[PDB]
Structure 1
Amino acid sequence: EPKKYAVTDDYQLSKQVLGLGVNGKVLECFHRRTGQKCALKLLYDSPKARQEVDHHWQASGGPHIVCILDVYENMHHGKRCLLIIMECMEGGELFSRIQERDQAFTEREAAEIMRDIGTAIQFLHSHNIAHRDVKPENLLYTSKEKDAVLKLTDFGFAKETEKYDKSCDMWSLGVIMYILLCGFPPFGFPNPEWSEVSEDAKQLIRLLLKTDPTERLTITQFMNHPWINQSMVVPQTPLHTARVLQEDKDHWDEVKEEMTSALATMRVDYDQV
C-alpha cells in the first residue's frame, strides 16, 4: 500500500492537466528512472479520498479499468494528500477519438466498445462496486494507436454495495450506447440517424433506459444480450456518429454537463417525484 516518502523522489511532475475529477486534478508526470509518462491524481486527504483510493485499487487490474501504478501519502501546501499514480491514457476520451474519424464508424464497432465497457462494469459489479458516474470524461484510451484499449476510471463516487447503485451504471451504459449509435444523447430513435440501426441495438437501449431502476437490465443480462454477447456478428453498418459529433461539437460540453447532472441526480438520497 501507500508510499509515505515524497512522490517527487520517484516522479517528475508537470503542470499539464490531463483531467478533472470530483476529488481532484489529473497531472502529467514521468517516472524518474524509467522515463514512462504517467498521470498524477492529487486527492486532498478525506474519507471520500480514502474511499476512492480504496475502490480504484481494488478495481485496478480488472479488465478495462485504468490501472494504479502507486499511491502516495504526502504533505503538499501544509495539507495531507493522496496521490494516485496511474497509467497515462494517451488516447484521450472515447468520443473525442470517434469524432476524430471521415472513416466508417460501424454498428459492430459500437458493440465492441460497449462490450468493453460492460466487461469493466461486470468486473466491478461482481466485486460489489458500483461506479455511479460512468460518463464521457471517464472513458479513456491507452494510446492514439489503432490497437488502443478502452478503460474506465475515476472511483470518486464509487460505492461498495445495492441493486439501485448498480442500476445507475446500467443506465450509463444505455446513455453511452445511445450516443455511440447516433452522436447525440437521449436527453425515441429518430431518422435519419437511427434509420439503419439493428433492432437488437434499439431493444438493448430500451431495456437499459427504463425509467424504473428495478426494470433495468443487470450487467449479466447486458453481457448475455446477443448485441453484446455476439458483438462481432453485429452488422458492419456505417453510423452517423462521428459526423454528428463533428457537426454538434459546439454543444458537446453541454451534453457532458447534463449527463453529469443526471448522474448526480441519481446519487441523491432523496429526490423529487
Structure 2
Amino acid sequence: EPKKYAVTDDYQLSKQVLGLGVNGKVLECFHRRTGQKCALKLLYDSPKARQEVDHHWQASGGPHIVCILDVYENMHHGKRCLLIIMECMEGGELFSRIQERGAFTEREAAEIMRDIGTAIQFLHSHNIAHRDVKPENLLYTSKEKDAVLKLTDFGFAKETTPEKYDKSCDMWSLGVIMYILLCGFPPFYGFPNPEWSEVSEDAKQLIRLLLKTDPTERLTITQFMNHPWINQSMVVPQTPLHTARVLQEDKDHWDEVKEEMTSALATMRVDYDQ
C-alpha cells in the first residue's frame, strides 16, 4: 500500500528540518488538499528501511504512538526512497516541555509514565520491541495543555516473531525515563538527597524493579501497568519535584545525557557484549 506516485503531488515540502533519525532526516510539509502541517521522514530503501516502515505501520493505531498518514515509494536523485508522512508533533520533546515552566509534581510524572507504559503495552502485546526509547523519541502533539505524549522512531524495532530480552530493553528505558522525570538527572546508581528526599517509596521501588542489571528480573510491561504507582496514578501524591529547576540549571550538558543514553541503548542491541 505504499503510494508509488511522487510525494510532492500530495505534499508541499519545506527546506525546513525537524531533526535526524538513524535511517532518516525529518522535514516539515503541508498537505496540498487540506491545511495540514505534517512531518516527513526520508528513508533510502533497504531491508531496514522496509522493516522500519512495516513496524511503524503496525503500531500506528495504538495509544500514544505517532500516527503515520501515508507512505510513498519514490525516486529521489536517482535513489529509491521511502517517505513516511506522520502527524506533526509540534509540542516537541518531553523533557523540553518540562523545562518550560518554573510546579512539576510526582503525580504528573506518574501520568506521563502511564502514557508511555500504554505505548509499550500496545507494542509488546503485538510482539514489537522498540529498543530505542529515549527523550528525543518522546514528543507532544502540541504546545497546548491538552497535548498528547507519543512515542516515535521504529528504526531499531524488532518483531519478536531474545524476544523477552528485547522487550526488557524497553522496560529499562522506562526506568531511566522515570528516574530523570523525578529529579532532573539520569542514573549514570542511587537516589541522592535532597532531590529524592520527598519522592514516594512506591516510585523508588518501581525504578529499582526496572533498572535491575539482570534482564530476566526486570519488570514486564504488564507488571509495570499493574504497579500501584502506575495503576493508581490519580492518587499518587501531588508533591513538588525539583525536575524542571534541575533541567534548567543543567541544560548545558543535556546533550551529554542524551548521548549517554543513546550509547547505552546501542550497547544493549549488540549480539555479543562485555
Please say whether Structure 1 and Structure 2 have the same fold, judged by a TM-score greater than 0.5.
yes
Question: What is residue 57 of structure 1 aligned with on the other side?
Answer: 57
Question: What is residue 254 of structure 2 aligned with on the other side?
Answer: 252
Question: Which whole-Å CA distance do the structure 2 matches of 1:15 and 1:229 have between them?
Answer: 44
The number of residues matched between the two structures is 269
1:267 Cα offset (Å)? 0.1
Question: Which whole-Å CA distance do the structure 2 matches of 1:15 and 1:169 have between them?
Answer: 34
For structure 1, which runs of at least 5 residues remain unmatched after alignment? none
Give the secondary-structure state (helix, strand or coil) at the position aligned to 1:112: helix
For structure 2, which runs of at least 5 residues remain unmatched after alignment? none
Measured against aligned partners, the alpha-carbon deviations of 1:198-227 in whole angstroms (never above 9, x if no partner) come to 100000000000000000000000000000
Give the secondary-structure state (helix, strand or coil) at the position aligned to 2:18: strand
Question: What is residue 186 of structure 1 aligned with on the other side?
Answer: 187
Question: Which whole-Å CA distance do the structure 2 matches of 1:206 and 1:63 have between them?
Answer: 26
Measured against aligned partners, the alpha-carbon deviations of 1:130-181 in whole angstroms (never above 9, x if no partner) come to 0000000100000000000000000000000x10000000000000000000
Question: Which whole-Å CA distance do the structure 2 matches of 1:174 and 1:15 have between them?
Answer: 37
Question: Which whole-Å CA distance do the structure 1 matches of 2:61 and 2:253 have between them?
Answer: 35
Question: Which whole-Å CA distance do the structure 1 matches of 2:216 and 2:256 have between them?
Answer: 29
Question: What is residue 10 of structure 1 aligned with on the other side?
Answer: 10
1:38 Cα offset (Å)? 0.1
Question: Which whole-Å CA distance do the structure 2 matches of 1:79 and 1:198 have between them?
Answer: 54
Question: Which whole-Å CA distance do the structure 2 matches of 1:147 and 1:4 have between them?
Answer: 36
- Deviating runs (4+, > 6 A) in structure 1? none
Give percent identity, aligned residues only. 100
1:20 Cα offset (Å)? 1.2
Question: What is residue 169 of structure 2 aligned with on the other side?
Answer: 168
Question: Which whole-Å CA distance do the structure 1 matches of 2:141 and 2:247 have between them?
Answer: 21
Question: Which whole-Å CA distance do the structure 2 matches of 1:216 and 1:125 have between them?
Answer: 15
Question: Which whole-Å CA distance do the structure 1 matches of 2:23 and 2:265 have between them?
Answer: 16
1:15 Cα offset (Å)? 1.8
TM-score calculated relative to the size of structure 2: 0.98
Question: Which whole-Å CA distance do the structure 2 matches of 1:19 and 1:218 have between them?
Answer: 32
Question: Which whole-Å CA distance do the structure 1 matches of 2:15 and 2:233 have between them?
Answer: 41
1:21 Cα offset (Å)? 0.7
Give the secondary-structure state (helix, strand or coil) at the position aligned to 1:64: coil
Equivalent positions of 1:224-243 (< 5 A) are 224-243=226-245
1:17 Cα offset (Å)? 1.2
Question: Which whole-Å CA distance do the structure 2 matches of 1:147 and 1:222 have between them?
Answer: 25
Give the secondary-structure state (helix, strand or coil) at the position aligned to 1:231: coil
Give the secondary-structure state (helix, strand or coil) at the position aligned to 1:213: coil
Give the secondary-structure state (helix, strand or coil) at the position aligned to 2:244: helix
Measured against aligned partners, the alpha-carbon deviations of 1:109-130 in whole angstroms (never above 9, x if no partner) come to 0000000000000000000000
Measured against aligned partners, the alpha-carbon deviations of 1:71-125 in whole angstroms (never above 9, x if no partner) come to 0000001100000000000100000000001xx0000000000000000000000
Measured against aligned partners, the alpha-carbon deviations of 1:55-86 in whole angstroms (never above 9, x if no partner) come to 00000010000000000000001100000000
Question: What is residue 111 of structure 1 aligned with on the other side?
Answer: 110
1:33 Cα offset (Å)? 1.2
Question: Which whole-Å CA distance do the structure 2 matches of 1:87 and 1:225 have between them?
Answer: 32
